[PDB]
Amino acid sequence: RVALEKSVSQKVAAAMPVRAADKLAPAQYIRYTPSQQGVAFNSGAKQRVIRMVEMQKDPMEPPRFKINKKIPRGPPSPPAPVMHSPSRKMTVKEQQE
Amino acid sequence: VVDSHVQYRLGNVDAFQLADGLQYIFAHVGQLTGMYRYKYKLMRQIRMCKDLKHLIYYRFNTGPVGKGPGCGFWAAGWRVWLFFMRGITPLLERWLGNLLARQFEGRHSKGV
Amino acid sequence: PTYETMFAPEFGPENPFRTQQMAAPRNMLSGYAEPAHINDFMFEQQRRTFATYGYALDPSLDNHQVSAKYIGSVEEAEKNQGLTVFETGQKKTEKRKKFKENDASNIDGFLGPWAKYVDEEEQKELDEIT
Amino acid sequence: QKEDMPPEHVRKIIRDHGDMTNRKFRHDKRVYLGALKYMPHAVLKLLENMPMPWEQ
Amino acid sequence: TKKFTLMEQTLPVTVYEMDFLADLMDNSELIRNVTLCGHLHHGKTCFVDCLIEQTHPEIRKRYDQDLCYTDILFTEQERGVGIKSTPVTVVLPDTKGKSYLFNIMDTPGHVNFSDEVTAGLRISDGVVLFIDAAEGVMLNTERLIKHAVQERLAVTVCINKIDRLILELKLPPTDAYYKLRHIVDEVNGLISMYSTDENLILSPLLGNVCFSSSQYSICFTLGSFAKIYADTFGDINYQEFAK
Amino acid sequence: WEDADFPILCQTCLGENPYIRMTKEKYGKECKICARPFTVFRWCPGVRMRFKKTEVCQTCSKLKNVCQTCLLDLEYGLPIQVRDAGLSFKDDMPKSDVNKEYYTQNMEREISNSDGTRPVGMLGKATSTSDMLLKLARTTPYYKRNRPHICSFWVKGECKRGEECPYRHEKPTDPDDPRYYGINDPVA
Amino acid sequence: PFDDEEPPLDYADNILDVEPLEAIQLELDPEEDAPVLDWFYDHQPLRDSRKYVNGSTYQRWQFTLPMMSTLYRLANQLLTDLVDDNYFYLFDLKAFFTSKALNMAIPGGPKFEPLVRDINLQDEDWNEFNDINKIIIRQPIRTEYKIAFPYLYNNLPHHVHLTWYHT
Amino acid sequence: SYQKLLKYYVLNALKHRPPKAQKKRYLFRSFKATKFFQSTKLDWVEVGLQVCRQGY
Amino acid sequence: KVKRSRKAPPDGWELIEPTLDELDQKMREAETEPHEGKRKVESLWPIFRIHHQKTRYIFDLFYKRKAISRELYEYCIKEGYADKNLIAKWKKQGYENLCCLRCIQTRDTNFGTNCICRVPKSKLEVGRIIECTHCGCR
Amino acid sequence: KGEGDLSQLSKQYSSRDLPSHTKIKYRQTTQDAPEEVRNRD
Amino acid sequence: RYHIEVNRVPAGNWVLIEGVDQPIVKTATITEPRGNEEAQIFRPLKFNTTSVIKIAVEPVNPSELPKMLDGLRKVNKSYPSLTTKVEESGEHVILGT
RNA sequence: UCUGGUUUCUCUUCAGAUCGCAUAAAUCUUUCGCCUUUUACUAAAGAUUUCCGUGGAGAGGAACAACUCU
RNA sequence: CGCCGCCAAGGUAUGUAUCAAGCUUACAAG
Numbered sequence A: 001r002v003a004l005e006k007s008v009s010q011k012v013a014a015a016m017p018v019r020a021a022d023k024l025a026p027a028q029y030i031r032y033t034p035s036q037q038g039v040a041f042n043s044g045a046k047q048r049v050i051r052m053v054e055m056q057k058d059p060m061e062p063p064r065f066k067i068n069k070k071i072p073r074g075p076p077s078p079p080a081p082v083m084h085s086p087s088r089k090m091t092v093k094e095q096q097e
Numbered sequence B: 001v002v003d004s005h006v007q008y009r010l011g012n013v014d015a016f017q018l019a020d021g022l023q024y025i026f027a028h029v030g031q032l033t034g035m036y037r038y039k040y041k042l043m044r045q046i047r048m049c050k051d052l053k054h055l056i057y058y059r060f061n062t063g064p065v066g067k068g069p070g071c072g073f074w075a076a077g078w079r080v081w082l083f084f085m086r087g088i089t090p091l092l093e094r095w096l097g098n099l100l101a102r103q104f105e106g107r108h109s110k111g112v
Numbered sequence C: 001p002t003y004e005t006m007f008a009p010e011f012g013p014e015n016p017f018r019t020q021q022m023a024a025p026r027n028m029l030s031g032y033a034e035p036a037h038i039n040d041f042m043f044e045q046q047r048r049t050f051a052t053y054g055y056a057l058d059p060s061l062d063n064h065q066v067s068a069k070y071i072g073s074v075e076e077a078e079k080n081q082g083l084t085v086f087e088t089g090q091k092k093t094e095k096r097k098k099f100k101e102n103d104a105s106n107i108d109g110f111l112g113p114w115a116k117y118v119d120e121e122e123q124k125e126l127d128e129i130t
Numbered sequence D: 001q002k003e004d005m006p007p008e009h010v011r012k013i014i015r016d017h018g019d020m021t022n023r024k025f026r027h028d029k030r031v032y033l034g035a036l037k038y039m040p041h042a043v044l045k046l047l048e049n050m051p052m053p054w055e056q
Numbered sequence E: 001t002k003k004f005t006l007m008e009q010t011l012p013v014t015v016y017e018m019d020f021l022a023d024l025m026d027n028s029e030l031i032r033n034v035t036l037c038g039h040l041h042h043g044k045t046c047f048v049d050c051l052i053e054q055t056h057p058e059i060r061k062r063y064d065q066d067l068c069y070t071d072i073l074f075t076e077q078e079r080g081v082g083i084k085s086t087p088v089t090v091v092l093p094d095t096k097g098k099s100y101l102f103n104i105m106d107t108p109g110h111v112n113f114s115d116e117v118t119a120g121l122r123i124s125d126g127v128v129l130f131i132d133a134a135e136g137v138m139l140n141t142e143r144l145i146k147h148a149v150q151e152r153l154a155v156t157v158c159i160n161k162i163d164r165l166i167l168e169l170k171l172p173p174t175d176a177y178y179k180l181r182h183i184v185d186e187v188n189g190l191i192s193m194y195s196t197d198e199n200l201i202l203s204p205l206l207g208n209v210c211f212s213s214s215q216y217s218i219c220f221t222l223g224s225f226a227k228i229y230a231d232t233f234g235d236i237n238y239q240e241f242a243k
Numbered sequence F: 001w002e003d004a005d006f007p008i009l010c011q012t013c014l015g016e017n018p019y020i021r022m023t024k025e026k027y028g029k030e031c032k033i034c035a036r037p038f039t040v041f042r043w044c045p046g047v048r049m050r051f052k053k054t055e056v057c058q059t060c061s062k063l064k065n066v067c068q069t070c071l072l073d074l075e076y077g078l079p080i081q082v083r084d085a086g087l088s089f090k091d092d093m094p095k096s097d098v099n100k101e102y103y104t105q106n107m108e109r110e111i112s113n114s115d116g117t118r119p120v121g122m123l124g125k126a127t128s129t130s131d132m133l134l135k136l137a138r139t140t141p142y143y144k145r146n147r148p149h150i151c152s153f154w155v156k157g158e159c160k161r162g163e164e165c166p167y168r169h170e171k172p173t174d175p176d177d178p179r180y181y182g183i184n185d186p187v188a
Numbered sequence G: 001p002f003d004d005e006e007p008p009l010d011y012a013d014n015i016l017d018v019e020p021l022e023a024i025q026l027e028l029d030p031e032e033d034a035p036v037l038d039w040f041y042d043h044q045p046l047r048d049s050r051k052y053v054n055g056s057t058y059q060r061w062q063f064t065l066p067m068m069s070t071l072y073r074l075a076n077q078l079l080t081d082l083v084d085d086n087y088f089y090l091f092d093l094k095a096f097f098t099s100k101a102l103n104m105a106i107p108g109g110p111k112f113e114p115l116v117r118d119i120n121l122q123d124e125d126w127n128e129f130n131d132i133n134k135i136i137i138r139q140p141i142r143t144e145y146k147i148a149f150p151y152l153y154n155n156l157p158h159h160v161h162l163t164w165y166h167t
Numbered sequence H: 001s002y003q004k005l006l007k008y009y010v011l012n013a014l015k016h017r018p019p020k021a022q023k024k025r026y027l028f029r030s031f032k033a034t035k036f037f038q039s040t041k042l043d044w045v046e047v048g049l050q051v052c053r054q055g056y
Numbered sequence I: 001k002v003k004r005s006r007k008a009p010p011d012g013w014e015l016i017e018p019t020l021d022e023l024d025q026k027m028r029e030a031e032t033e034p035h036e037g038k039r040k041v042e043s044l045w046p047i048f049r050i051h052h053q054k055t056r057y058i059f060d061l062f063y064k065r066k067a068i069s070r071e072l073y074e075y076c077i078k079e080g081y082a083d084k085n086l087i088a089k090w091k092k093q094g095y096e097n098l099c100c101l102r103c104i105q106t107r108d109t110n111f112g113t114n115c116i117c118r119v120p121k122s123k124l125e126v127g128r129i130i131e132c133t134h135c136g137c138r
Numbered sequence J: 001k002g003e004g005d006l007s008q009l010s011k012q013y014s015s016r017d018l019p020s021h022t023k024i025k026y027r028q029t030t031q032d033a034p035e036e037v038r039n040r041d
Numbered sequence K: 001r002y003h004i005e006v007n008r009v010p011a012g013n014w015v016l017i018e019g020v021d022q023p024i025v026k027t028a029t030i031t032e033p034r035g036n037e038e039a040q041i042f043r044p045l046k047f048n049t050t051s052v053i054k055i056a057v058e059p060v061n062p063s064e065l066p067k068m069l070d071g072l073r074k075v076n077k078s079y080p081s082l083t084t085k086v087e088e089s090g091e092h093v094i095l096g097t
Numbered sequence L: 001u002c003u004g005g006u007u008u009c010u011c012u013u014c015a016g017a018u019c020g021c022a023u024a025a026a027u028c029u030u031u032c033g034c035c036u037u038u039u040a041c042u043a044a045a046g047a048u049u050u051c052c053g054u055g056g057a058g059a060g061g062a063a064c065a066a067c068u069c070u
Numbered sequence M: 001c002g003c004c005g006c007c008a009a010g011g012u013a014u015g016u017a018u019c020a021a022g023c024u025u026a027c028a029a030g
């Protein structure tokens, strides 16, 4: 109930989100050890903490992106095995019936 | 309505004449906007202006006042054309939401 | 939880089959990215200290297990001996004197903070490129 | 703590933008269509505040 | 399902728990029950509201509509006429001020509801009459004192609406006295149409008639008013001054 | 179509500051290959440098182990076909608009939802490395990537901004040597 | 009042320094309209005066009785002389609700459409046994009688409201 | 026209269901907290010509 | 010119009226001139500049010089020849050479900060001749 | 992560999808509410 | 409008009972059933007005007549001056004031 | 002798009240009425929303706040 | 005792092949 409750709450706060919510408080920093290159890349860039804020959206903008695309449906779940009973064949006479 | 007030503040029409002006505007929409044509439920309010106009326009003319133009008592038509917009704000805000969506992200053929 | 459990090293020849980057820890395809709760003001102060003067203290948790140096270009830190931007400095040198008209009386002569300062062959190559 | 600005700012912006037929302002014209959604709510808040005839 | 104006919570009054019913036991015999009768719109079911606000310190007093919650039925809160009494049991203190009891009935005053007042007259003896000072005696008033002295009940009278006499008709004080003297003389000469009780007349001096305004909750009469002459700056020794 | 939490970003694009402040949108621009609406991020690398926002989505970066804005290798700091010829395998991807394009991006996203840690097919041959590519893996990178691109009106000598022209000046570019796989001019 | 192909007039160079003409402004004299005189034609009339109004949100107001008696004198010609709801016997809202519920009309009152109580039926023996040209008609039952008290003059009433009686 | 205004008066006073609205939001107190909207204090007819210019 | 208070204003308004008429004429010239060449937002700097100097003229004429009385000062504000708000930020301690009110609004800015017009130039880096994009310069 | 058009991908606030009947009647005690079903014969 | 519970009622007062009034239609007195003093019943009260207007009354459905008789009897209990009758031609009748 | 606060701006839930001394528009379900079909419609009932507004509440300032209710 | 006041679609086909503004980013880049 709480899983589908937060699902439908995010849904109606995205399907009908039109009414006056606050933006966020994105003061939350994020520290990330740049674990790829660091030897003299930004000499001393051991762990490089950054400040991530969220840009304001003006409420006078139309939808921006063309949501009109259609590709065919992809590969489904790869098939489970089938496992019937041993398949019979009837006759050449009742098949003729 | 804005052209009436700007005609007054250009100074080439005066206050009694402006008041009679936008009383005629609020009383005689339909004859001068053709808004009923696209949303016909508001024809009621056109008639509700034209009805209450009689209320005012036959108490101006009580006594030695005369049967001509000059009834610049425009509150009672202004009110009902605001009470229109009181409930036509969400509806055609939603209609224009769908219009601007379909213009800026295209219509969905066989979606819903 | 005990210190000995997590501090216990890993047995093995370290698996040098990989590259340096893929053997390195991550969660995001580029480095272990994790949240933080630093003070806003000291973040901004040491940020502006590096952004102006090219040195700051280094942020870490477990690099050497002890880290207390400066980074960037090192020697200019001890040229100023570790001062900041919010400090009335030891000297007032290489200042640059603006001319001020703050009366709001003369017209086309009032420049308040809008004062423009007292300081105020290639085209052959540019025409041949275009 | 955000408050009024000089009234000669709105005049300058709208006199500049004009009829949006110059190419300098083309990044803004999209936003103009985006403000069509809230035009009836601008006209309502306009016409609520007509000056009464006893005013100038 | 629908209700007919139920109340609960047995609202706090002054004393009426079992710490005072134990002395209401013998005071269940000195109760001096009344059935106040009046004409139609003469303020008596608002008068009982005035005294029940005097009792209860919990009110939703009239700022917009009157508090006629003794007209309880839904067929009488929309008419405003009174169809059915609900008699009340309170206490009332006097100028001495220990207690009395006053179980009190307040009949409809409409002439076609001459029924229910009779059903109070065979119960109790107090027939305190309500008259508008601004309007006079009328049909149910004269018929109802006639029916009261036919039952020889104790015909006292509480004439009402003297604010309506003077805030509304705006009479000068001498003419207001002329109107009140006229109305007390008219009910006196009307009671003395059936003279089995020739001595029994009513006047303010006998303590027999109290003026009022139930719109603004004033009790009046001079045996109680010379108390308010007395407790502030008088030392008058009333009830000889009052008479 | 796509949300994110933090970008890919090779080290030369972050800039020389360990303390950088960076802003995010929710559906920003589109990817410049597959037109997918990622979350564009923006920051200032250095005090003499342009902003260098974010160019492709996280999906089109996880495909070829590529950084987020300058389109170079996340392991080396090299172009794409240098890596794929230097690992002798191309990890094909179509060219047209739908013809297998958004189909294969959608499906390779669907089979990349589990890990989010490593590229999808390069993981097996990014180990047998460091011989032919390590000779050219330019560490201590040059930050001329981050400098702001050349303004006009200095090209025409008109620039009324004077000093405060933020972009650049007196760098006339040369029209003789300036996408995702091939062919690219400086790589030859 | 303006032709087409004329852009709407540009309030900077057109009517910015143009002074307005005159408002309506019925002239109030002193010695009778003395309280309201200083403020009566003002945009919000008492706004920055803590004695008479709340404040700058302009939510609450308290006046004094000369200042309101003059306003009550000025506000005739559109204010009714009816002192009580006694003119409105059978023009009340509840009389109108009853007239709506009972498909009938007070003369000079509104005429609605019927509601769900549309068609009645009684078989011939029953309404013939109750109602012939047998009853003592003296004067007709008008519809004002039925709207007055709709129970003894009207069989099967419902969804009905019940009017006030003599303030 | 008298009785056809009493008809509307009765229909409004009859169907007066009490206002069960739950939350209060404002949409101008929501706009003004953004970096994009700025407040000013203008003449009336300026704002009228303003929004008719914008609507065109 | 519109006065909107029918006051017959107090004294001495006659000695500031030619000054304020000159500033209004220059504000009409700084409001009307075209926007070609002037890039996008430097064409709106001068209205903030002359608004600043008009409010500063009434400011230092009243608080500093004490020439004009209080009543005419409140008149010049209530008409429109000054800000009620920006003198209230000029009276406060650290900032009275201020540009205008847009460099104080900390949510006009995206990072939740005050603009770099409002940074002590002595303690910024030495040579960058930055002009505020809102208000015009420091 | 990028659902269908109802979630984020569309601003088409269609009517018939407007917050009607937005609270649920639960079956109260005088009807056959499931507490009065957990024991009945 | 409210109701306070009483254990016992001494004389002089009045009170409402709870449930003696099934075999009653108008005023009467009550005593103890012990064959006691036989209080020769109080006289019924005199209205001093004559109920003279007289409506005939009928149920709409002729089926459920006893339910409107129950209602009519409860009316006759609660309104003391009412006089209801039924006569030879079958119609019920109420005469009131 | 001590006690010692109205405005104005933002958030924070509760609304049970003519929340509003007046009164919009929509959706659904039925009956109408015009109707050729569909939206524009009609004019009654039922039940739902949206919208233009309001009421009491926590917090943060700033505005004479030190005039003084207490 | 005094209804009523009217827009759109439904007809002058659509489907291809070359030729600019409208709109779109002003970017990644030895």
Ligand SMILES: O=P(O)(O)O[C@H]1[C@@H](OP(=O)(O)O)[C@@H](OP(=O)(O)O)[C@@H](OP(=O)(O)O)[C@@H](OP(=O)(O)O)[C@H]1OP(=O)(O)O
Binding pocket: B050, B057, B067, B068, B069
């Ligand atoms: O609507 P218009 O034809 O323009 O004229 C209307 C009105 O018309 P309706 O009553 O049909 O709405 C009446 O005029 P008529 O009905 O007589 O045509 C009205 O009442 P009076 O005629 O009794 O005044 C008055 O007409 P008038 O011009 O006589 O004032 C008024 O005129 P306005 O158009 O100026 O409002």
Ligand SMILES: Nc1nc2c(ncn2[C@@H]2O[C@H](COP(=O)(O)OP(=O)(O)OP(=O)(O)O)[C@@H](O)[C@H]2O)c(=O)[nH]1
Binding pocket: E039, E040, E041, E042, E043, E044, E045, E046, E047, E066, E068, E071, E080, E081, E082, E107, E108, E109, E110, E160, E161, E162, E163, E164, E212, E213, E214, E215, E216
């Ligand atoms: N002026 C004035 N009016 C009063 C006074 N008392 C009551 N009223 C008004 O009289 C009206 C009708 O009287 P009610 O309050 O119903 O009292 P009532 O006389 O018992 O009426 P019934 O119950 O029908 O017998 C009320 O609406 C009051 O406003 C009064 O003392 N002075």
Ligand SMILES: [Mg+2]
Binding pocket: none
């Ligand atoms: Mg068809």
Ligand SMILES: [Zn+2]
Binding pocket: F031, F032, F033, F034, F035, F036, F056, F057, F058, F059, F060
């Ligand atoms: Zn992509």
Ligand SMILES: [Zn+2]
Binding pocket: F009, F010, F011, F012, F013, F067, F068, F069, F070, F071, F072
């Ligand atoms: Zn990069």
Ligand SMILES: [Zn+2]
Binding pocket: F151, F152, F153, F154, F159, F161, F165, F168, F169
């Ligand atoms: Zn330049």
Ligand SMILES: [Zn+2]
Binding pocket: C113, I097, I098, I099, I100, I103, I117, I118, I135, I137, I138
């Ligand atoms: Zn500044």
Ligand SMILES: [Zn+2]
Binding pocket: I048, I098, I099, I100, I101, I102, I103, I134, I135, I136
């Ligand atoms: Zn500024």
Ligand SMILES: [Zn+2]
Binding pocket: I099, I103, I115, I116, I117, I118, I132, I133, I134, I135, I136, I137
């Ligand atoms: Zn600035």
